[PDB]
Design a protein around this nucleic acid. Sequence first.
RNA 1: CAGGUGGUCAGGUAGAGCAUACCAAGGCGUACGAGAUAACUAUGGUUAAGGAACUCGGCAAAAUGCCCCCGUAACUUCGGG
RNA 2: AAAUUCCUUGUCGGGUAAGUUCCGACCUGCACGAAUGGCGUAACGACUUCUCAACUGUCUCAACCAUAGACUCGGCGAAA
RNA 3: CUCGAUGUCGGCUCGUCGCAUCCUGGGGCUGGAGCAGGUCCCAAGGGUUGGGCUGUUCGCCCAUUAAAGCGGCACGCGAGCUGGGUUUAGAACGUCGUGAGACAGUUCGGUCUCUAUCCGCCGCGCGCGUCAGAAACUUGAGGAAACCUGUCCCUAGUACGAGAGGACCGGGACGGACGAACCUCUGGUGCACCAGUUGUCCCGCCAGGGGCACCGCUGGAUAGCCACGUUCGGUCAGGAUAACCGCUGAAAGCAUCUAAGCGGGAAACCUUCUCCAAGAUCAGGUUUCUCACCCACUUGGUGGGAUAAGGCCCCCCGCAGAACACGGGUUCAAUAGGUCAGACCUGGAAGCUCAGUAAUGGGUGUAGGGAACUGGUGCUAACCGGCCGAAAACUU
Lengths: 116, 54, 122, 213, 37, 112
Amino acid sequence: PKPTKGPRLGGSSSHQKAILANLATSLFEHGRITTTEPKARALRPYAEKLITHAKKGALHNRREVLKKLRDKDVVHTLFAEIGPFFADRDGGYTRIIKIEARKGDNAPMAVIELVR
Amino acid sequence: AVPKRRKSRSNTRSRRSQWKAAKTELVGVTVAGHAHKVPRRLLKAARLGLIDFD
Amino acid sequence: MIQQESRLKVADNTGAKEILCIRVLGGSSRRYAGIGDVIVATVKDAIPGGNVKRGDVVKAVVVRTVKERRRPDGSYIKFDENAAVIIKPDNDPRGTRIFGPVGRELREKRFMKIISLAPEVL
Amino acid sequence: ARKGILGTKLGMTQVFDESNRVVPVTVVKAGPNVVTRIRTPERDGYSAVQLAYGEISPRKVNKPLTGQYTAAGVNPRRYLAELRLDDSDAATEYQVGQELTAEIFADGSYVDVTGTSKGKGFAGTMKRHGFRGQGASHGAQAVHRRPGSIGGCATPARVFKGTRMAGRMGNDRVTVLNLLVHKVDAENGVLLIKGAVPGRTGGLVMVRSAIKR
Amino acid sequence: MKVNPSVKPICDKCRLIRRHGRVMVICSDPRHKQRQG
Amino acid sequence: MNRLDFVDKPSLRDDIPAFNPGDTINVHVKVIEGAKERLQVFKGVVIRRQGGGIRETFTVRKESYGVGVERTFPVHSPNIDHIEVVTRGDVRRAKLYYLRELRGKKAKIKEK
RNA sequence: CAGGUGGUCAGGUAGAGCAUACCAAGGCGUACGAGAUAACUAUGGUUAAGGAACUCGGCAAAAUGCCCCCGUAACUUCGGG
RNA sequence: AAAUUCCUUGUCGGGUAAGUUCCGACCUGCACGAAUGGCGUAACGACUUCUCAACUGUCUCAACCAUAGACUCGGCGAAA
RNA sequence: CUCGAUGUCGGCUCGUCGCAUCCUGGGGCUGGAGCAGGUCCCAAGGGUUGGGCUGUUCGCCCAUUAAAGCGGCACGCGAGCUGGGUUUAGAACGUCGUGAGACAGUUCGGUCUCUAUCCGCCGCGCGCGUCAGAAACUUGAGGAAACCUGUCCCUAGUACGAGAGGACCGGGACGGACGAACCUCUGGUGCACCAGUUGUCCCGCCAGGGGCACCGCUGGAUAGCCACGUUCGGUCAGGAUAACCGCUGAAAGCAUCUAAGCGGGAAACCUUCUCCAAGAUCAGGUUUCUCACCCACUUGGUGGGAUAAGGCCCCCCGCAGAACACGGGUUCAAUAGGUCAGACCUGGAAGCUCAGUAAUGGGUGUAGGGAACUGGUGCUAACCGGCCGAAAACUU
Ligand SMILES: [Mg+2]
Ligand SMILES: [Mg+2]
Ligand SMILES: [Mg+2]
Ligand SMILES: [Mg+2]
Ligand SMILES: [Mg+2]
Ligand SMILES: [Mg+2]
Ligand SMILES: [Mg+2]
Ligand SMILES: [Mg+2]
Ligand SMILES: [Mg+2]
Ligand SMILES: [Mg+2]
Ligand SMILES: [Mg+2]
Ligand SMILES: [Mg+2]
Ligand SMILES: [Mg+2]
Ligand SMILES: [Mg+2]
Ligand SMILES: [Mg+2]
Ligand SMILES: [Mg+2]
Ligand SMILES: [Mg+2]
Ligand SMILES: [Mg+2]
Ligand SMILES: [Mg+2]
Ligand SMILES: [Mg+2]
Ligand SMILES: [Mg+2]
Ligand SMILES: [Mg+2]
Ligand SMILES: [Mg+2]
Ligand SMILES: [Mg+2]
Ligand SMILES: [Mg+2]
Ligand SMILES: [Mg+2]
Ligand SMILES: [Mg+2]
Ligand SMILES: [Mg+2]
Ligand SMILES: [Mg+2]
Ligand SMILES: [Mg+2]
Ligand SMILES: [Mg+2]
Ligand SMILES: [Mg+2]
Ligand SMILES: [Mg+2]
Ligand SMILES: [Mg+2]
Ligand SMILES: [Mg+2]
Ligand SMILES: [Mg+2]
Ligand SMILES: [Mg+2]
Ligand SMILES: [Mg+2]
Ligand SMILES: [Mg+2]
Ligand SMILES: [Mg+2]
Ligand SMILES: [Mg+2]
Ligand SMILES: [Mg+2]
Ligand SMILES: [Mg+2]
Ligand SMILES: [Mg+2]
Ligand SMILES: [Mg+2]
Ligand SMILES: [Mg+2]
Ligand SMILES: [Mg+2]
Ligand SMILES: [Mg+2]
Ligand SMILES: [Mg+2]
Ligand SMILES: [Mg+2]
Ligand SMILES: [Mg+2]
Ligand SMILES: [Mg+2]
Ligand SMILES: [Mg+2]
Ligand SMILES: [Mg+2]
Ligand SMILES: [Mg+2]
Ligand SMILES: [Mg+2]
Ligand SMILES: [Mg+2]
Ligand SMILES: [Mg+2]
Ligand SMILES: [Mg+2]
Ligand SMILES: [Mg+2]
Ligand SMILES: [Mg+2]
Ligand SMILES: [Mg+2]
Ligand SMILES: [Zn+2]
């Protein structure tokens, strides 16, 4: 989606891609994850485009997601229930709830999860 | 560059009093039948019970 | 755009095959020579036994540039080489024929002879 | 009789004149303006006409400003700015509530366009004032974009006011003068002003008749 | 006009006058026209 | 679509043939040599389409006299009465910039 | 504590190689973090046209770069170059 | 006319569009000179110096991108 | 003055000032026919090039130019840069000295620290004030910025000149340099775009992909930012004037620009153009909105409480941005994201299938993928909220 304006998360752009892939995997595996608020905001459009591929559901879309995520089990979970359960919802697959900042660095924290 | 002279009390204090903590906006919430006071940005989490109230 | 210490190949038959832009004439501190700008140049190498000898300070007009030039109609002209032709103080070429294509911008700068003997004008 | 219109910069494009010449044009939607107020020399001390431009939801305007609009007897607008006129024969033609529109300007007329130039943030001295900077090499130590000297010596033991230094560029009121109006189409309230116009695509601009002609 | 701190008549028809706080000589010959400064 | 398509629409022309980078075309351009208003052909391979509607430009290249020449025209420029595709080109890039360092048979484009 | 510290072992693919790139075994993420497109500095990268015009000076950078096959000047101390 | 020449950017020639530097000479050597070696010399040089080709952000004349800082927030918290 | 340290030349960067003016502007005289000049006067608004040599300043030269001005500011400027020269320690030559050594003699090498406290400057906020509290639009006291110029054509080969040569004054066209805005074009960039590709490791394998190797490399590349790009400006007209040219006109029957008086008169000055601007504490103007209560005391231009208009903080964002500020939006919502559709970029996906021994090629199929640009969409987040914040009168 829309490229990061400013320094990318974790330092480099490559570390950015790794972070978004790993958080998308965790989000699809657990339904709900806690991360820093900037990471949650960066995840949201990335994860929703993955769900959009899952809703399309074709082998090409499978390969498109698999191009980004490496976990076969999570990609299977995506295309087996996450996509189908969002099939009748037009975008807005995720939700960010702002939670209390974490001690040690006062990093603002957020929960990101799938809508239902 | 080094300080040429020590600041006076007045000048030091005039600068130093401006180092203060930003006040957090607090609103009242009622979850689980009990009243509490939380920052406004955390109201959603407070209603979802995601905020450890201590 | 051609500036001082730029080498242009010579698109005529005066003998010079490469000249070095000395000044871009047409004003104080003028920087670049586009198509049809007049240059004073030194001949950096010429054919052996040629009319125009190495180390000669000559006047030349730029007739093709590798930097693309806008025409007023929004089109652009681009060549693969920077080339000039040595001219006399009356803007006629010192040589007797022009090699290679020539930018049409020389027509409205009154290089009419050069236009006439150019192989084809764009 | 200097004329003016409040509009929005919609971006640029090219067209071609009758002479088959390309013409870069900024299109400005000179949306209809209402007057809402006349400034008179004997009551305000100067001659001007307010112009209101831009649809806004009436709930979005505070009641001190809605009161001004309703005393003018017009629907509240989003932008409001005065066009300053000469000192005589000021309001013989502008009535509060009259709807002045793009074809107040004519084809081939010359306009002055005022806008708020695009923000540039805190800008260095090269970008902000065109300083040459320093060499990229030959020993230059960490001064490649730095201003260099900023004053003299013991005389004067200070740096003069107006010394060009780093600071915020942009967001300045800027007027470009004598821009040709290639075309005004009355069908949809847009003028095609030849050249560049200051500010964002979407920003408010005031198009006045060029007094330099 | 000759501008010198020393102005004196050159020929017999050089009128030497003082106008606007400064002295000068005016003459039929304009080469003799000459002003103190 | 774009916000300025309404300004765009009248300045466009139909009857501009479909053509792609790698195609060789004849571009007939009107040229004013005094008060003659003649038509000059420019025969060359299309090396670029740089899109955008009225602002779309296209660059075609040839080798006139030992010198490569590139002409960039606005499509929908009224200075071109019409373009004709003399051969369809088969390339696998969109901008064919490599031919500006190739001369001779090694700067050729196939016929599909 | 980005320095220093003698010796032993040291796999795979590519590679001439103990270079280098990615890996194995085996370790590690090493001890402030979280953000943020300011200037500016640093470290890298790209750059139209020109190509040393820079500068004390081509400093820095760029360029060249490998294997095989051709071919190779003045000069020479006959080895070279 | 030199790692030596003050006068001096000597003079002539070459190289450059233009050369106080460079090369070849002249000899008027302020103040060269034969083992504190003289004059040459293939090879060699992270030496000094001059030229050319190539190459380039060195420059014309800068622009943009990423990262580490700078900046903000939380913690610790100096210095001359 | 400074030795309990005031860093020395040149360059770079940034300037700023004077005018003894190089150009441009205005004039007088000329041994000024014209074109050009010479000289003097006025004039500092702007401009005043790039190279070769040298450490250089200077100077000479090359090519230009309207012109390539001269000076000051610690021979402006090293807590801004450089470090070539000079001026430590090494070494050599010449020369001097028995020598150690020495030399405004030469030669090669040899250094550039500091996190900005104060003033100063460039920007940006917070507070208060501005006789009620606010919002919008504004005046302009006073500032800032800006101020360059060429060539050609017509006038006219006319005036002038014996000819050669060759105008003034006016009008037009096109430029150079500089500046500003902008991104349509051109061009650059492009670190979540597309494609190709090398090595390797991995996804069990094939296929298809992924990690890393500078973004691995390579070809492109929308947005944004930008210049090499685009557009515009530098004007005109007034006022008061400089040098200078006068009118009327005495003292001084004449005469005289002056003594009374009145004119003309330049890029200088002031208006005019652009921008800032009421902290302009003389804190302005035109409007519009709220314009309302409650409690207590030592009853007071009293304190509180509650509010109004309004605003702030919070939230969703922005092409606005260091923070802050600014701007937009917050469900009577298209603000961001998603999503759908376009635009554009890349360039023909995967799978299947056909041809080929295969590398590969064709069909499905202008494919697939995709950021910034545009519109639709109420799916996600902008929430079930806290804090600031309103008037004695009295004089004509
Ligand atoms: Mg970006
Ligand atoms: Mg990488
Ligand atoms: Mg910005
Ligand atoms: Mg420069
Ligand atoms: Mg630079
Ligand atoms: Mg340093
Ligand atoms: Mg540096
Ligand atoms: Mg005398
Ligand atoms: Mg006078
Ligand atoms: Mg296209
Ligand atoms: Mg250690
Ligand atoms: Mg290794
Ligand atoms: Mg960080
Ligand atoms: Mg380049
Ligand atoms: Mg190039
Ligand atoms: Mg070259
Ligand atoms: Mg040089
Ligand atoms: Mg060279
Ligand atoms: Mg130089
Ligand atoms: Mg080097
Ligand atoms: Mg290199
Ligand atoms: Mg050799
Ligand atoms: Mg020597
Ligand atoms: Mg000599
Ligand atoms: Mg010699
Ligand atoms: Mg001896
Ligand atoms: Mg010896
Ligand atoms: Mg050795
Ligand atoms: Mg950065
Ligand atoms: Mg801190
Ligand atoms: Mg002391
Ligand atoms: Mg003077
Ligand atoms: Mg004169
Ligand atoms: Mg000046
Ligand atoms: Mg002025
Ligand atoms: Mg040289
Ligand atoms: Mg000066
Ligand atoms: Mg000094
Ligand atoms: Mg000086
Ligand atoms: Mg210095
Ligand atoms: Mg200093
Ligand atoms: Mg002795
Ligand atoms: Mg000494
Ligand atoms: Mg030295
Ligand atoms: Mg500092
Ligand atoms: Mg004023
Ligand atoms: Mg003041
Ligand atoms: Mg600008
Ligand atoms: Mg665009
Ligand atoms: Mg482009
Ligand atoms: Mg991708
Ligand atoms: Mg495979
Ligand atoms: Mg790995
Ligand atoms: Mg672009
Ligand atoms: Mg005037
Ligand atoms: Mg204003
Ligand atoms: Mg006020
Ligand atoms: Mg706001
Ligand atoms: Mg789409
Ligand atoms: Mg088969
Ligand atoms: Mg196929
Ligand atoms: Mg196939
Ligand atoms: Zn006389």
